[PDB]
């Protein structure tokens, strides 16, 4: 409704913080508001299962 | 010696080509000469071995 970025984006868009050296997903809706650098960490959704010990 | 970029970089640095929609590794020595976009393809060195041919 109010279209207010909260969080670390709200500290960069609204001038509160100077830079965010933090784990932040580069999205398109966050691309237009702040300048991301290149991705330092390629990642994605992974499958956490229990390691097996069963019998 | 002559510090001349060949290849597709030499077509972008020396104005011959307009854009390179091509598989090109984003390196630092290529970052300073041309503007890369964000990486569309996370990749790296992989281990190609023969499939087990248990016959």
Curated annotation (Swiss-Prot), chains A, B:
Family per record: Belongs to the glutamate-gated ion channel (TC 1.A.10.1) family. GRIA2 subfamily.
Induction behaviour: Down-regulated in the pyramidal cell layer of CA1 in the hippocampus by global ischemia.
Expression tissues: Detected in forebrain. Detected in dendrites of neuronal cells. Expressed in the pyramidal cell layers of CA1 and CA3 and in the granule cell layer of the dentate gyrus.
Organism from which the protein derives: Rattus norvegicus
Lineage of the species this protein comes from: Eukaryota, Metazoa, Chordata, Craniata, Vertebrata
Binding residues annotated for L-glutamate, in chain numbering: 23, 25, 30
Annotated domain remarks: The M4 transmembrane segment mediates tetramerization and is required for cell surface expression.
Protein name per the record: Glutamate receptor 2
Residues of the full protein shown: 477 to 531 of 883
Role, per record: Ionotropic glutamate receptor that functions as a ligand-gated cation channel, gated by L-glutamate and glutamatergic agonists such as alpha-amino-3-hydroxy-5-methyl-4-isoxazolepropionic acid (AMPA), quisqualic acid, and kainic acid. L-glutamate acts as an excitatory neurotransmitter at many synapses in the central nervous system and plays an important role in fast excitatory synaptic transmission.
Comment field (misc): The postsynaptic actions of L-glutamate are mediated by a variety of receptors that are named according to their selective agonists. This receptor binds AMPA (quisqualate) > L-glutamate > kainate.
Record's subcellular location: Cell membrane; Postsynaptic cell membrane; Postsynaptic density membrane
